[PDB]
């Protein structure tokens, strides 16, 4: 099998702990910019499956031995919503392969959730990248001007940065609970337990913990509806800055209503001694109490 080298290769291109590939995914997120306005030809998978293979050499990492294990399948979903023009923010999926000796490691259930994990990073990375694209819009020569006055930039950029405060520290805490203890539990434990027979009964339990640690939402809770509504204002955040100052100040009060809406559901998930993100959410709540 040489399984530990294949195990490290899955971590680098599905879990994204060598972030050069997911930073290059942000450049692939910098090639969509809203959906749908993309071609619907059959050349649309032909040039788009290529540029992800070309993106690995763009970061100068890995040989072609593991690059055969990565494949990309461009799915088809409507984004103008009557015709098709498929996305690359949530409709571009990495497909890991099943090969000749290594089949007790990878099954069809674990590749189903590899598509779930790859599509879930790709939308939060689209948030953080386009949130920094606005900093490119007002970047210094000067562009946007009025450093404090006239019509607001002083309190304008004050609510915009405390917006980009909260998102940039949520994603860092979600990143720390996905990656670290799971990588500490995985290889070491499995190998040392010299219990190595019928590997997919343990690897799928490891992957089920790896999706337990992300958000897991029982794949049904309204927390997935709030990560969509807070995504629904970041497009509203980026369209007003590309283009309105009164329509601005209403839009982030709606964010502060939705962020306080995101705080009150967490207080309803509360149960006790449970969900290592729940305490990490209650970190900020006891931060919210002292100020």
């Amino acid at each position: 099998l040489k399984m530990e080298r294949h195990f490290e290769a899955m971590r680098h291109f599905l879990l994204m702990e060598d972030g050069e590939f997911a930073q290059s995914l942000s450049d692939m997120l910098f090639e969509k910019l809203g959906s749908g306005q993309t071609p619907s030809e059959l050349l649309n998978p032909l040039v788009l499956n290529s540029i992800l293979n070309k993106a690995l050499q763009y970061s100068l990492h890995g040989d072609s031995s593991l690059a055969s294990n990565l494949t990309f399948a461009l799915k088809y979903l409507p984004e103008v919503f009557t015709p098709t023009a498929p996305d690359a923010l949530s409709c571009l999926e990495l497909k890991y392969k099943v090969d000749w000796p290594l089949n007790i490691v990878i099954t069809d259930t674990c590749m189903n959730k590899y598509s779930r994990i790859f599509s879930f990073l790709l939308q939060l990375k689209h948030m953080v990248w386009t949130l920094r694209d606005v900093w490119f819009h007002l970047k210094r020569t000067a562009l946007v001007n009025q450093a404090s006055n006239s019509v607001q930039y002083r309190q304008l950029q004050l609510y915009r940065h405390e917006m980009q405060h909260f998102v940039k520290v949520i994603q860092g805490y979600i990143a720390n609970q996905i990656l670290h203890v799971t990588w500490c539990e995985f290889r070491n434990k499995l190998s040392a337990v010299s219990n190595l027979e019928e590997i997919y009964k343990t690897h799928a339990d490891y992957l089920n913990k790896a999706l337990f640690r992300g958000l897991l939402t029982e794949k049904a809770a309204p927390l997935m509806n709030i990560i969509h509504s807070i995504f629904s204002l970041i497009l509203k955040f980026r369209l007003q800055l590309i283009s309105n100052f009164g329509l601005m100040q209403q839009s982030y009060n709606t964010f502060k209503y939705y962020s306080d809406f995101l705080f009150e559901v967490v207080s309803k998930l509360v149960n006790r001694g449970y969900q290592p993100h729940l305490e990490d959410f209650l970190l900020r709540i006891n931060f919210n109490s002292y100020y």
Partner: protein, 436 residues
């Protein structure tokens, strides 16, 4: 991809960047004239982010070094690390400068060598088709680094408008005023350019250096040979997410974006604890991560001269706590658990705060893969105490009739002194207004 061009400039800016490049070869496992170790690609997964990309596996530094004084560059070529530098990117042999000690010297020399100063430093710009930005590794002390450095903060703002600007600038020393007396004039002229003609700075105080240089380092006569040891480590510490493979805020526009509240409020407090070599004999017993960030917010490792009783009415807004190397990440959320119970950071009452922690694996080396390292990038609103210290030393000097007749003979016809005074008070008033 993510190529940054460092702008090493001045008498002090060239020496702090000389050992910055010398620090990078010891951690990349490379030699300045050859490649003798294979640890450069298996251990380090990314090397072409500050160096120029290789033509013969020779990672050229993307560096330029201009100074009026030829003494700083004549102590370079006899060292065996200068063959890594190129004698065609910046200057050939026997480069000189002015006489020279004036802020108006380098401010007037920028437009007479205007053709040559925008010719060879732009050849490294089009090497990569996606340029990150420019860091001005310059100085505030003296008239050499402060005179010419204020010119490039203006003409690179519009010729390269979509690039990040952020500097690691060192503050001068305010102990006595005998050898230099022009220190309040050349500092405030560059400090105006650091806020409106520049996005971010990284402050590095000089009076706080000898506070640390006699703390654990145990010297009797303070020399200039110790100023490069505290500075070169935290420079390479700030790019550990950028040089070594990280995931989040792995770019220089990633780290600075999550800490700046607003323009003209960008002065970041720096902290770095581990500087002692006899700690190495007791780190073999699994020294954890639970004790290394309890002392970062405690004002012991700070490099900023600030008031001790002025922290109750001031509030932290953004605090960075960077752990490196061996982290034991099953307890890094445990270290952030203990932050809310002490409330060592005063939080802003108008909005949320953030304690961001990140990690990256260090160099495959024995003093690096054994001892825990903590890099702090704070942002506290007590930084106006330095601005109150510099302004009180500025208006007191203008009432003593000091350098008003000796400074306005060359290229100064109007009084631009209160143009620096009001803009400094604009920074000092908007800081206290920022917590409503």
């Amino acid at each position: 991809p993510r190529e940054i061009i460092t702008l090493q400039l001045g008498q002090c800016g060239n020496q702090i960047g000389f050992e910055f490049w010398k620090q990078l070869c010891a951690e990349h496992g490379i030699s300045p004239e050859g490649i003798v170790e294979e640890f450069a690609t298996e251990g380090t997964d990314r090397k072409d982010v500050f160096f120029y990309q290789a033509d013969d596996e020779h990672y050229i530094p993307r560096a330029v070094l201009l100074d009026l004084e030829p003494r700083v560059i004549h102590s370079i070529l006899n060292s065996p690390y200068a063959n890594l530098y190129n004698p065609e990117n910046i200057y050939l042999s026997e480069h000189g400068g002015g006489a020279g000690n004036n802020w108006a010297s380098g401010f007037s020399q920028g437009e007479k060598i205007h053709e040559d100063i925008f010719d060879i430093i732009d050849r490294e710009a089009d090497g990569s088709d996606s340029l990150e930005g420019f860091v001005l590794c310059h100085s505030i002390a003296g008239g050499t680094g402060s005179g010419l450095g204020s010119y490039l903060l203006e003409r690179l703002n519009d010729r390269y408008p979509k690039k990040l600007v952020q500097t690691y600038s060192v503050f001068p020393n305010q102990d006595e005023m005998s050898h230099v007396v022009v220190q309040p004039y050349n500092s405030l002229l560059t400090l105006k350019r650091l806020t409106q003609n520049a996005d971010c700075v990284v402050v590095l105080d000089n009076t706080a250096l000898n506070r640390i240089a006699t703390d654990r380092l145990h010297i009797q006569n303070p020399s200039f040979s110790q100023i490069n040891q505290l500075v070169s480590t935290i420079m390479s510490a700030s790019t550990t997410t950028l040089r070594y493979p990280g995931y989040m805020n792995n770019d220089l526009i990633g780290l600075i974006a999550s800490l700046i509240p607003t323009p003209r409020l960008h002065f970041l407090m720096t902290g770095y604890t581990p500087l002692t070599t006899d700690q190495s004999v007791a780190s073999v017993r699994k020294t954890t991560v639970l004790d290394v960030m309890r002392r970062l917010l405690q004002p012991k490792n700070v490099m900023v001269s600030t008031g001790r009783d002025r922290q109750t009415n001031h509030c932290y807004i953004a605090i960075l706590n960077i752990i490196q190397g061996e982290v034991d990440p099953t307890q890094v959320h445990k270290s952030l658990q203990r932050i809310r119970e002490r409330k060592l950071a005063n939080f802003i009452p108008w909005g949320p705060a953030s304690i961001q922690v990140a990690l990256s694996r260090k160099s495959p080396y024995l003093p690096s893969a054994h001892r825990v390292s903590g890099l702090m990038m704070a942002n506290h609103t007590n930084i106006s105490s330095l601005f109150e210290r510099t302004c009180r030393q500025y208006d007191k000097l203008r009432k003593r009739e000091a350098f008003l007749e000796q400074f306005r003979k060359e290229d100064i016809f109007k009084d631009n002194f209160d143009e620096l005074d009001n803009s400094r008070e604009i920074v000092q008033q908007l800081i206290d207004e920022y917590h409503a």
